[PDB]
């Protein structure tokens, strides 16, 4: 029986507990005695499992927390639309997209920072933005600043509604645990209503607003002269002027004569040649199909009527001879443990963000996006980073489940148990394959460096010496390019230019050309495979040995996050799963930095550039230079760092400042990573003496940071430094040569 269940007025709305720091924890509510308390107060603020044992109260807390997050995001979107309406050059950009740089941030004229307002065109001065909002807004059919302003007000109103919803569903009407545990109903409603009705309503907006406005914009008529969207809904004669299908109305829909809707529901493929983006008619058909698919998918699970599947029954039905009880117990795990759910959802959400990065570079969905090289680099890089972070988080919360929620007396000879029971075999095989990948992938680079240094280029791994061609990827590429002729007859062109074919250019710049894969591409892909496998090794080892190992047989009783178990047994520093997340974070940084470097150099070398033949940004040096480390060091980092290092005295000077600042923060992290808190505690003792001598010793006792906090501060400043460094490099480079 699926129904609404709610408790009335559980928690009174009062400012009392705001005035009592650490009220949520019985330990921290005693007050502060040393400085450690403060850090604890912020570290355990949102760890709701350590607050209460009651799953209902925890579930309510996470629900209202999620509402808070959504309100914050709505404030953020409201801000972006408002700054796009009031402090931007969006209309001028609409009138000339190929020669006006998108800018939506202006600085005030104080202390000389006014220089950051550069000549972006359109009679405007500001910082060129690379988020891609202008291309998104043109694709949505927005033409005036007024519509953006109204969207800003709407998003602010929605943020107020989200914070009211949070307060309401925590303090006034807070859902019960059996409401939260209706996962079959939740899947039905989210697959139908969210994804399904989302893409249906978006396809509605596209077909009714986007297609005509962008068809006129591609035709060339002045945006102010283009009819307003409500007129397009009101007078169907205009819709029939652009696409005659609309003359017949919704009669071909209900009579199943859908072929007459071919004017705006197409299957062209490729890119719009005058605009460099995917066809909005293809995107409209795509969202209609997606809508129908998800609405079909959302009627699968049984709720209040006999029809529908049962999650526990589908899980308990798939059992084989090799796995024993199979998927028995997993339903119970995934309907009582928030951390298991968070692990799964983070893994797929991160992976999905990486897929978003690749598919959005390869098949540019917004108009005048592919030739906004800065926007393309920024979007790819950004979503790749977000992805990687969410994957590391997935490993983290998997381990947190393994320590806090795992209970084998409901989980006995099961998939999870067998994984735990042959973890040594798993980790040893992963270990070997990581060493193998490392040796042969990195060893080719070291081999090439040595041969190149010794004056023997004929002994290198390259396209002219000993070739290592990516035959499989080339075959898949060729197949994908030849697909419209045989295996996808209704396709006018391939889904992406990178498979092969011609060349689409907009405003003299290359939007997309065919990407060729050679020995250097082989080598970087196996580097990627190596780094990903190592990251998986660390995280998976962390989750499999979170409970016990031959070294620490009772590791589970020590918790998820703990420094060690002492210098005995040879030394047990960093045995915790938290410390495995810490190392996985460093390795994730390594992997994704080489990934975004691959993308940057490959695009600037073999894809981007001006059309006269195509003159690429770096002349095509990738195929011969990307086989040695010296080649990456000289032709990529050193060569392309010119723009960032000589950005002083111009509008890009902030990128030089943040280059230096990021280098500094990265280095600053090394003190925390390389040192230990005993030294710092003793130093603080001497300083405390000095303060005592002058009667200024605080009542809250100065303590060195904990071992785990030293590691956390270390990795956070390390990531911030490195990532911000590559950020400044990338943005200064691509804005100056773009």
């Amino acid at each position: 029986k699926v129904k609404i269940a709610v408790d009335r007025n559980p928690v009174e709305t009062s400012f009392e507990k705001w005035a009592k720091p650490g009220h949520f924890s019985r330990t921290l509510s005693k007050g502060p005695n040393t400085t450690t308390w403060i850090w604890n107060l912020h570290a355990d603020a949102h760890d709701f499992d350590s607050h209460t044992s009651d799953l209902e109260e925890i579930s309510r807390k996470v629900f209202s927390a999620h509402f808070g997050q959504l309100g914050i995001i709505f404030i953020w979107l409201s801000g972006m639309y408002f700054h796009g309406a009031r402090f931007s050059n969006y209309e001028a950009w609409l009138s000339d997209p190929t020669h006006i740089k998108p800018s939506a941030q202006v600085v005030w004229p104080i202390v000389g920072q006014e220089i950051l307002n550069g000549d972006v065109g359109g009679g405007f001065q500001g910082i060129q933005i690379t988020s891609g909002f202008f291309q998104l807004w043109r694709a949505s059919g927005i033409t005036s600043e007024l519509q953006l302003y109204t969207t800003a007000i709407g998003g602010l109103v929605m943020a107020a509604a989200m914070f009211f919803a949070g307060w309401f569903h925590y303090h006034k009407a807070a859902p019960k645990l059996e409401w939260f545990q209706n996962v079959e109903s939740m899947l039905n409603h989210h697959l139908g209503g969210l994804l399904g009705l989302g893409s249906l309503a978006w396809a509605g907006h596209q077909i009714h607003v986007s297609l005509p406005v962008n068809k006129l914009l591609d035709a060339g008529v002045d945006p102010k002269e283009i009819p307003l969207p409500h007129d397009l809904l009101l007078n169907r004669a205009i819709m029939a002027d652009l696409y005659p299908s609309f003359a017949k109305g919704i009669a071909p829909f209900f009579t199943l004569n859908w072929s007459e809707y071919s004017d705006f529901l197409t299957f062209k493929g490729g890119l719009n040649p005058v605009t460099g983006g995917l066809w909005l008619s293809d995107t409209a058909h795509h969202h209609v199909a997606i809508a129908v698919l998800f609405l079909v998918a959302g009627h699968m699970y049984r709720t209040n009527w006999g029809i529908g599947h049962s999650m526990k029954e589908i899980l308990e039905a798939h059992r084989g001879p090799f796995t024993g009880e199979g998927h028995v117990g997993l339903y119970e795990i995934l309907t009582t443990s928030w951390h298991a759910q968070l692990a799964i959802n983070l893994a797929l959400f991160g992976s999905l963000s990486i897929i978003v990065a690749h598919h959005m570079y390869a098949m540019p969905p917004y108009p005048y996006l592919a030739t906004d090289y800065g926007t393309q680099l920024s979007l790819f890089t950004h979503h790749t980073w977000i992805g990687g972070f969410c994957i590391v988080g997935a490993g983290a919360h998997a381990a947190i489940f393994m320590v806090r929620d795992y209970d084998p007396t409901n989980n006995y000879n099961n998939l999870l148990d067998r994984v735990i029971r042959h973890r040594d075999a798993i980790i040893s095989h992963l270990n070997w394959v990581c060493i193998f990948l490392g040796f042969h992938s990195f060893g080719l680079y070291i081999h090439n460096d040595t041969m190149s240094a010794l004056g023997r280029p004929q002994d290198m791994f390259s396209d002219t010496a000993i070739q290592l061609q990516p035959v499989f990827a080339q075959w898949i590429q060729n197949t994908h390019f030849l697909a419209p002729q045989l295996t996808a007859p209704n396709a006018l062109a391939a889904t992406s230019l990178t498979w092969g074919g011609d060349l689409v250019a907009v405003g003299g710049k290359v939007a997309m050309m065919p990407i060729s894969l050679g020995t250097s591409d082989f080598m970087v892909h196996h580097i990627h495979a190596f780094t990903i496998h190592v990251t998986v090794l660390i995280l998976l080892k962390g989750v499999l040995f979170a409970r016990s190992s031959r070294l620490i047989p009772d590791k589970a009783n020590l918790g998820f996050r703990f420094p060690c178990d002492g210098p005995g047994r040879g030394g047990t520093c960093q045995v915790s799963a938290w410390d495995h997340v810490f190392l996985g974070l460093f390795w994730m940084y390594n992997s994704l930095s080489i990934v975004i470097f691959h993308f940057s150099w490959k695009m600037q070398s073999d894809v981007w550039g001006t059309v006269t033949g195509v003159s690429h940004i770096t002349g095509g040096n990738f195929a011969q230079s990307a086989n040695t480390i010296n080649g990456w060091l000289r032709d990529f980092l050193w060569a392309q760092s010119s723009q960032v290092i000589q950005s002083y005295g111009s509008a890009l000077s902030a990128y030089g400042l943040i280059f230096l600042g990021a280098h500094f923060v990265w280095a600053f992290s090394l003190m925390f990573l390389f040192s230990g808190r005993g030294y710092w505690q003793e130093l603080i003792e001497s300083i405390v003496w000095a303060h005592n001598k002058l009667k200024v010793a605080p009542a809250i006792q100065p303590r060195a940071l904990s071992i785990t906090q030293g590691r956390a501060v270390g990795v956070a400043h390390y990531l911030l430094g490195g990532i911000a460094t590559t950020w400044s490099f990338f943005l200064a480079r691509i804005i100056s040569v773009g």
Partner: protein, 75 residues
């Protein structure tokens, strides 16, 4: 006796920073070698011991050898 200017000023100040700081770590390691308030019996473990465990808030790099070790970076 090279001609000197404000860059030479700033670098000699950075040099004094490095010297005083390295001297801070090395003198702290010499004078806290017998013991500190975090570990009063540091002389009973010797010069180069790993740590004294995670108790008392954790004591990583508490030894005088480890203070030397942290000061090689400043050198």
């Amino acid at each position: 006796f090279l001609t000197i200017g404000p860059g030479d000023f700033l670098v000699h100040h950075a040099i004094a920073l490095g010297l005083h700081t390295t001297t801070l770590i090395l003198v702290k390691g010499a004078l806290d070698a017998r013991g500190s308030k975090l570990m009063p019996d540091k002389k009973d473990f010797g010069y180069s011991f790993p740590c004294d465990g995670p108790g008392r808030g954790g004591t990583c790099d508490i030894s005088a050898y480890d203070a030397f070790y942290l000061a090689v970076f400043w050198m």
